[PDB]
Amino acid sequence: TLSILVAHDLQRVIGFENQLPWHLPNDLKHVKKLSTGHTLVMGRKTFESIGKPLPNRRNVVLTSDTSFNVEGVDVIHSIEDIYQLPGHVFIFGGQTLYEEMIDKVDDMYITVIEGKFRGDTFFPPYTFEDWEVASSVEGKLDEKNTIPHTFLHLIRK
Numbered sequence: 001t002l003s004i005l006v007a008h009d010l011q012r013v014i015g016f017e018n019q020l021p022w023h024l025p026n027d028l029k030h031v032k033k034l035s036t037g038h039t040l041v042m043g044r045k046t047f048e049s050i051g052k053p054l055p056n057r058r059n060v061v062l063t064s065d066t067s068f069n070v071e072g073v074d075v076i077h078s079i080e081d082i083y084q085l086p087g088h089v090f091i092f093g094g095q096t097l098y099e100e101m102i103d104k105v106d107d108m109y110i111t112v113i114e115g116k117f118r119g120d121t122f123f124p125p126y127t128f129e130d131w132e133v134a135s136s137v138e139g140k141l142d143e144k145n146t147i148p149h150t151f152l153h154l155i156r157k
């Protein structure tokens with residue numbers, strides 16, 4: 001299975017200055033829950049913002065840099081390499097990867113951040129006439145999770 005994994009705001013912002021525009025612990029837990037034991041594919045900029053591989057899952061970074069060799073990280077140099085990765089593969093950003101993969105994935109795990117943030121990177125436009133809502137679940141708000149958010153699982157119609 002090939003899945004997009006992303007959080008975007010009401011205007012599809014996903015990033016600002018190579019970081020998430022929001023602080024939302026519960027979404028990071030959501031990402032951790034979904035991707036643990038599986039594979040995360042990320043563009044080079046996204047990986048460098050994280051800085052180290054996320055524990056307990058396969059970390060795959062897409063880059064043109066043939067000198068890239070990071071302990072705990074598997075490198076790939078083309079989109080086509082993604083299709084060789086066994087198991088459940090999550091496309092985990094950034095903008096370039098989402099743009100390259102949105103027409104190819106089976107489904108998408110999208111956290112809609114119900115706010116308007118300043119962004120410099122965006123998730124590409126999509127329509128629900130192409131995607132069925134398999135589930136839609138409101139995130140719980142608390143002390144440390146203060147922005148309304150909704151967990152969507154969308155499956156290509």
Ligand SMILES: NC(=O)c1ccc[n+]([C@@H]2O[C@H](COP(=O)([O-])OP(=O)(O)OC[C@H]3O[C@@H](n4cnc5c(N)ncnc54)[C@H](OP(=O)(O)O)[C@@H]3O)[C@@H](O)[C@H]2O)c1
Nearest residue numbers: 006007014015018019043044045046063064093094095096
């Ligand atoms: N909101 C979310 O759920 C979420 C999740 C992850 C990331 N993000 C955000 O996304 C933003 C980064 O997005 P971005 O588009 O600027 O960068 P990116 O997608 O993370 O990285 C772009 C780089 O990926 C490599 N790449 C992409 N496609 C390639 C291809 N077909 N062949 C070879 N290399 C390829 C290239 O690396 P080289 O230049 O080294 O060749 C390219 O410069 C950050 O702000 C981050 O916070 C948001």
